[PDB]
Chain A
Amino acid sequence: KNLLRNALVSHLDGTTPVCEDIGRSLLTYGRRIPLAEWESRIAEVDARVVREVCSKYFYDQCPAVAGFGPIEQLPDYNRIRSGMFWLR
């Protein structure tokens, strides 16, 4: 959370990042989101939320993989897909 808290305030420093944030926000989110609203959603997140959300998007899901270079060792997709869930 604190890394992300610091990331938001670090990024919106100078005019160009804030002007980007506005222009992007209105195209994507529809409105500009205040830093207080962001903080409300960060403070909302605790350990259970991270687990419920990470497990939702990652656990037992086929991932899109892209390899470029000396990639003879790059694991087989079945082995990567086997790694996308656990032994449990």
Chain B
Amino acid sequence: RQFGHLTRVRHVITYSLSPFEQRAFPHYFSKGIPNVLRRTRACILRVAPPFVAFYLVYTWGTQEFEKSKRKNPAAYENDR
């Protein structure tokens, strides 16, 4: 496991450019924000709904905890 003994690669050509010759942030807001959005659209459907379902169970459970904490109308009413 070293550079030279990794694997057999053939017929590939890699064109590169010096970091001083090229830019650091090439088309960052131009090409990026769309690419970021595309990536968000790809994942969102798989990622979000469980956290939404958590939020629903969270607020509901806290709501129902506050309901059960509070008074009830059958506590000695219509019973003097």
Q: Given A62-B18, A72-B6, A73-B4, 7 more contacts at CB 8 Å?
A: A62-B21, A72-B4, A72-B9, A77-B16, A77-B18, A78-B19, A81-B20
Q: Which residue from A72, A73, A81 sits with its C-beta under 8 Å from B18?
A: A81
Q: Size of chain B's interface in residues, with CB distance under 8 A?
A: 9
Which residues of A (54-74) have their CB < 8 Å from a CB of B? Answer: 62, 72-73
| Chain B residues proximal to chain A, CB less than 8 Å | 3-4, 6, 9, 16, 18-21
Q: Size of chain A's interface in residues, with CB distance under 8 A?
A: 6
| Chain A residues proximal to chain B, CB less than 8 Å | 62, 72-73, 77-78, 81
Q: Which of B3, B18, B19, B21 has the largest count of A CB atoms less than 10 A from its CB?
A: B18
Please indicate the chain B residues that have their CB under 8 angstroms from the CB of A73 in the complex: 3-4
Please indicate the chain B residues that have their CB under 8 angstroms from the CB of A72 in the complex: 3-4, 6, 9
Q: Which residue of B lies closest to A73 (CB)?
A: B4
Q: In the bound complex, what is the Cα–Cα distance between A81 and B22 (angstroms)? A: 14
Please indicate the chain A residues that have their CB under 8 angstroms from the CB of B19 in the complex: 77-78, 81
